[PDB]
Amino acid sequence: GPVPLLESNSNMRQMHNGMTRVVGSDYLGVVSVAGNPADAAAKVRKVLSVSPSSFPGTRLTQMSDLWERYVFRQFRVRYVPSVPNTLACQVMVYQDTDPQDDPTAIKDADALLRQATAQTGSQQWNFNSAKVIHLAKRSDNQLYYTGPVKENPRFNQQGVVYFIQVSQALDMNGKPLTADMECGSLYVDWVIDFQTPQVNP
Amino acid sequence: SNMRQMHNGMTRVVGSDYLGVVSVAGNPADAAAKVRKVLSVSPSSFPGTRLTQMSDLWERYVFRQFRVRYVPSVPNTLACQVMVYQDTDPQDDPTA
């Protein structure tokens, strides 16, 4: 047809609008638990941003820099224990859709634990066993920017994950644990939509 | 003229929350130390819950139910034996 001929010597690279699903899973990190929490702010144990770009050296961050905007279709945190059943401690995790809250400002532990128990999708369990945790949906379906924070976090992150210690790390014989324990590790099972391709600084 | 129209009907609300963590001790010191945790049983006494925020929107309340449910944190290689109860007289104080 005419088109291959017109193509033959005109510099027109095509535009490429459109979505792109990608699926994967990644290893986020190790998690510790102190024997004698008392700072109240110390009860929080592992905050995380819920953005593709925030976990260096993973497949997510590598892929994330190559586009412009993103939306998770599911973001499912998973926890794998590395502790003997004889030991005792209790733990909860919750995801929060609003990046600007920061629980830690509260001076009393009870209010932290109660705020955590509130909000849908929250989870608490013994730190001896595996569990799985979900995001809540947002009806509007906004796109979010990729990359490191610039001025306002709300343009970027869909949310924040909080890993919160409850009770105290505890030993056989029931003495409170000295120092720290490696406990377990966090994982992610994700699906994402990307929009317009690029590279960014 | 503008008038807030009147109501007298009572309104139920079903739900569930979270009271808090509790501990023990190896030494029966004092013997007044046997009491270990104390909680008032009212709406608007549990900060961090949705219900305490809800509670200021009305003058009066009545619980029709209030089931506490203890959840273990410990393996069967330990023991303490514990009791729990709900006194209905707020003035009463065991500690004395």
């Binding site: 400002a105 509260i106 001076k107 009393d108 209010a111 705020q115 | 900060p47 961090g48 305490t52 925020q53």
Partner: peptide
């Protein structure tokens, strides 16, 4: 912010 208010 709602919670900080109820705690003195």
């Amino acid at each position: 912010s709602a919670v900080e208010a109820r705690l003195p």
